Amino acid sequence: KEVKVYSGRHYNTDKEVYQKFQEQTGIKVRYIETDGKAIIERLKREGKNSQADLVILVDAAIIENASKANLFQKINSNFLENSVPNNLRDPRNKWFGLTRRLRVIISNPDIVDITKIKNFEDLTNPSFKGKVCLRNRKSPYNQSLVSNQIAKKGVGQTKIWLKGLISNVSTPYFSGDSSLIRAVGLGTCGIGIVNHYYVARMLDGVKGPRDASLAEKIKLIIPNPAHVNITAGGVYKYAENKTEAIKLLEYLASSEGSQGLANKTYEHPLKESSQNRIVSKFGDFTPDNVTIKELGKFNSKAIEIMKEVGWN
Ligand SMILES: [Fe+3]
Numbered sequence: 001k002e003v004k005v006y007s008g009r010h011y012n013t014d015k016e017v018y019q020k021f022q023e024q025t026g027i028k029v030r031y032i033e034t035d036g037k038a039i040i041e042r043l044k045r046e047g048k049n050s051q052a053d054l055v056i057l058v059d060a061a062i063i064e065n066a067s068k069a070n071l072f073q074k075i076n077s078n079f080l081e082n083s084v085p086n087n088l089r090d091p092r093n094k095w096f097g098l099t100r101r102l103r104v105i106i107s108n109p110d111i112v113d114i115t116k117i118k119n120f121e122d123l124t125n126p127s128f129k130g131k132v133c134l135r136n137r138k139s140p141y142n143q144s145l146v147s148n149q150i151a152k153k154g155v156g157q158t159k160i161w162l163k164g165l166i167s168n169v170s171t172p173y174f175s176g177d178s179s180l181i182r183a184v185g186l187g188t189c190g191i192g193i194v195n196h197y198y199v200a201r202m203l204d205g206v207k208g209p210r211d212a213s214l215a216e217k218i219k220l221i222i223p224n225p226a227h228v229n230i231t232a233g234g235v236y237k238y239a240e241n242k243t244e245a246i247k248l249l250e251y252l253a254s255s256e257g258s259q260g261l262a263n264k265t266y267e268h269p270l271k272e273s274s275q276n277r278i279v280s281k282f283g284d285f286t287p288d289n290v291t292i293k294e295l296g297k298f299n300s301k302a303i304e305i306m307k308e309v310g311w312n
Contacts, residue, residue, distance in 0.1 A: 002028035003244035006043070007056040009231055013264035020260065021251050027244050036062045043071055043236070046304030052236040053245040056098070056252075060147070061140035063095055063232050063302050064296030072234040073242075079250050084270060087291045088230055095234035097292065098252050099261050100268040102196045102228060102285060105221040106181065107309040118224040120149070123191060131190030132165065135180055136173035137306040141195060141229070142213030144295045146302035148227045151294045155301060162309040173312055178202070178211075185214030195229075197218070200266035200278045225288035229295070231261070 009039045017162040018029040027279055032039075036057045043050050047091055055071060057063050066072065068124070076096035080089070080096050088097030107114050116122060123132055132141040135142055173181040181202060184192045201207065201232065202215040233252055251257040258270040268274045273284070 001026070001241070001244055002004060002030060002309055003241045003248050004030045004051050004053045005030065005032065005056065005248070006039045006052045006054070007033045008039055008058050008062065009033065009056055009261070009265070010035055010058075014261060017252070017257060017260040017264070021201040021248055021257070025247065025251075026264045029148065029248070035199045037065075040066055040069060040071065044069055048238045050236065050238060051240070053239040053241040054233055054248055055236055056231065056233040057095075058231045059140040060144045060295035061172065061299045062227055063230075065301055065307075066234070067094060067296070073237045073239070075235050075246055075249075077246055077250060084253055087287070087289060088228075088232075088270065089292075090234075091293060095232045096249060096253055097230040097270060098258060099231045099265070100228050100270065102226050102268075103141055103193060103229070104196050104199075104226075104282075105223065106192045106194055106199060107219045107221060108184050108187050108190055108217060109219050110217075111187055114219050114221070117191070117221055120145075120165075120193075121161065123168065126168070128191060129168050130170045131290050132168040133171045133180060133183055133189035133192050134165075134169055134173055134210065134311070135177055135193070136175060137178075137303065137311045141177070142193075142301075142311075143299055143302045143306070144229050145193070145227060146306055148288070148290050148297045150298040150301055150305075151290045152288070158304055162305060162311065166311055168311050181218065182211065182214050185217040188267055189215075190299060196279070196282060198268040200276070200282075203278050204266070218297065220282050222283060222285045224286055226285040227289045227290070230292055232268075232292070257309070260268050 017134050074093050086094050177198045180192045183189040202211045212223050233249050262269045
């Protein structure tokens with residue numbers, strides 16, 4: 001028996017976890033790891049001829065794209081239904097969260113006054129004019145942040161916030177989070193918005209000594225309440241090895257599988273915060289209770305309004 005996994009978790013750090021499942025169960029795991037959007041396009045084109053069984057995707061936005069493209073089938077699993085928090089699954093049981101990440105504020109204390117920064121709203125403060133730097137709007141991460149703001153506050157108030165934030169940006173938009181972290185730790189940017197785990201990975205040396213140096217200079221700020229995003233897995237609509245796929249998903253979503261995945265990328269497990277010392281030090285967070293499904297719903301509107309204010 002085998003199962004075929006097409007995984008959007010393109011970190012090059014998950015193979016160990018599939019090995020554990022293989023030993024424990026005997027089920028052979030055949031694993032492709034690449035860009036999520038490349039997987040979506042391939043599956044649409046292959047259809048009933050695809051050899052995917054289990055699909056894993058990063059970020060609410062891409063999960064929404066796969067769901068709109070009808071890539072998942074509904075599954076029944078007493079375990080998943082009763083172990084995965086409602087806010088991090090499909091209310092219609094086509095996908096299930098596996099790891100949690102936070103999009104957070106980073107800062108350089110020698111450029112800006114951190115005592116004035118608590119939440120995202122604070123970044124419209126005109127004293128930060130010239131000092132704010134962002135990754136571009138093509139990142140699903142960014143789109144999902146803005147979607148979060150629309151869920152709670154509605155479209156009107158989000159625009160106000162966006163105009164005020166983009167007013168303070170005087171630097172070309174970045175193409176990655178990692179390079180945004182450099183610019184903050186170097187001091188050419190005062191403030192950035194990045195995912196937590198990139199700061200932790202760089203602190204831990206994963207990208208060599210210079211980046212580790214630049215990362216030590218930053219002050220990470222977790223907004224309260226926090227915006228939470230996920231990686232998620234679902235069973236392919238035409239999966240040949242359906243039984244095996246569910247089982248593997250059941251394992252990835254358990255405490256062992258979830259910790260396994262999360263510990264590789266410095267993310268938080270599904271039901272409890274990370275035990276990693278570097279991640280722990282960022283401090284404790286509280287989820288704002290916006291559901292991953294809501295983040296999907298408003299992804300369209302978010303990109304509309306992002307373009308309208310000038311977030312390129
Ligand atoms: Fe990422």
